[PDB]
Amino acid sequence: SMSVKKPKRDDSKDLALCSMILTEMETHEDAWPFLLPVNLKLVPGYKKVIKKPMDFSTIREKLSSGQYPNLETFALDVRLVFDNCETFNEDDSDIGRAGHNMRKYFEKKWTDTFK
């Protein structure tokens, strides 16, 4: 509350560390469905159904331009990518399995880097 604060967690490395995680997600062999925005002209149903499209290149540009106010807003966009994938793709598809795998990979890096 006013003039009452918990001890200050050092957040000075968060930007660098989120960038490193994102590099590791970019270079994973199962990243291919997520590297670029889904083409809304060429994929029937996507525009109407997926209310907030998100992809790694869009996260990278937001990251690079100071559009994440803190590390939690960064995690929310990463998770959005996988939540969108589960909304549109069957679990038993190459893209559906890709999404589950990447989400796992991300959540471990996130815990190991920050928790």
Q: Which CATH number fits domain 1-115: 1.20.1060.10, 1.10.10.60, 3.40.50.720, 1.20.920.10?
A: 1.20.920.10
| In contact, 56 and 81? CB cutoff 8 Å | yes
Closest CA to 74 of 102, 106, 100, 49: 106
What resolution in Å is listed for this PDB structure?
A: 1.8
DSSP-derived letter for residue 10 is -
User: Left (φ > 0), alpha (ψ -120 to 50) or beta: where does 39 sit?
Assistant: beta
Contacts of 19 (CB under 8 A, 6+ apart): 63
Contacts of 12 (CB under 8 A, 6+ apart): none
Delimit the domains of the chain by residue range.
1-115
User: Left (φ > 0), alpha (ψ -120 to 50) or beta: where does 45 sit?
Assistant: left
The identity of residue 96, as a single letter, is G
DSSP output for 57-97? HHHHHHHHTT--SSHHHHHHHHHHHHHHHHHHS-SSSHHHH
Contacts of 24 (CB under 8 A, 6+ apart): 105, 109
